[PDB]
């Protein structure tokens, strides 16, 4: 880092370079040992969280890969589809969480004082978690419906999740495929010599 600091043309862009920012943030915690009582505990607790970024130095190496540049361009050029995907997921999660929470209470036993005792869906946020896990076809199995109405809601959730995930992902994938094909074409093609000498 010091050798790189030796020569730093356009220091504004050098500071704006995210790679050097990551380098400095990753090198700060160790160098803070000499600088480092009451505030020291808090700054150490946050220094662990800073050291968490030490894994981000692998991007320094992987920046020279072509596929990662193509992926970055795809992400930057497909923001609308990401917004569409997050909106679809939020709507589906909310609706199915509410539906499953209300479905699981139909078969609730009257004896127990609490509203729901035998079901994992004791509230709606648990419904959010289950809805994500079920729409992504992940299916951990930590929480699942245990009532016929809950089972119907779960089948609907799985199907609607498959559909609302397979809607924009093909668009994003096609964008990446186009970008990767073009980048590999431009990389493969040998440097031209401009055979065609244009007429004046």
């Amino acid at each position: 880092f010091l050798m790189r600091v030796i020569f730093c043309p356009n220091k504004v862009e050098f500071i704006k370079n995210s790679l050097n920012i990551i380098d400095f943030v990753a090198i700060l915690p160790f160098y803070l040992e000499v600088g480092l009582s009451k505030a020291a505990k808090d700054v150490l607790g946050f220094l662990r969280v800073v050291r968490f970024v030490r894994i981000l130095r692998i991007f320094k190496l992987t920046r020279h890969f072509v596929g990662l540049r193509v992926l970055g361009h795809t992400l930057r050029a497909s923001t609308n589809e990401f917004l569409l995907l997050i909106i679809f997921l939020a709507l589906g999660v909310l609706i199915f969480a509410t539906m499953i929470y209300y479905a699981e209470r139909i078969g609730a036993q009257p004896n127990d004082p609490s509203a729901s005792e035998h079901t994992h869906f004791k509230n709606i946020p648990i419904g959010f978690w289950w809805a994500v896990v079920t729409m992504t076809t992940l299916g951990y199995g930590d929480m699942y419906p245990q009532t016929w109405s809950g089972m119907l809601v779960g089948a609907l959730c799985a199907l609607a999740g498959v559909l609302t995930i397979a809607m924009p992902v093909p668009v994003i994938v096609n964008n990446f495929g186009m970008y990767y094909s073009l980048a590999m074409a431009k990389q493969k093609l040998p440097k031209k010599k401009k055979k065609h000498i244009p007429r004046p």
Partner: protein, 118 residues
């Protein structure tokens, strides 16, 4: 004496000699030179050189000569255009990146797919 008419399979393609003279070493470059009557097929009654080739792809070859960028017509097979530009002398490694992956596709696939009682 600046215009030249190419008769390619019965379709008259007309152009200036400067256009042909842009890309040297190729067949049409030799056409543009003044010693072309003897070298090539030519009839003085219509002042046209005759080539017995597909005209629809010669449109794109001549477009390469005119504009300066080689493109592949999306209405003919890859091997057809490859063989045509092989005949005309154009190098195949000049096609633009926009139409290189579809051109060099079938050839990539084809290359990938390839004592008495003894």
């Amino acid at each position: 004496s600046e215009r030249i008419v190419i008769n390619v399979g019965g379709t008259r393609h007309q152009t200036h000699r400067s256009t042909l003279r842009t890309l040297p070493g190729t067949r049409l470059a030799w056409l543009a030179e003044p010693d072309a009557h003897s070298h090539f097929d030519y009839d003085p009654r219509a002042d046209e050189f005759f080539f017995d080739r597909h005209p629809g792809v010669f449109a794109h070859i001549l477009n390469y000569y005119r504009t300066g960028k080689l493109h592949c017509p999306a209405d003919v097979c890859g091997p057809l255009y490859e063989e045509e530009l092989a005949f005309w002398g154009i190098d195949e490694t000049d096609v633009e990146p926009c139409c290189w992956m579809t051109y060099r596709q079938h050839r990539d696939a084809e290359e990938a797919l390839d004592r008495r009682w003894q």
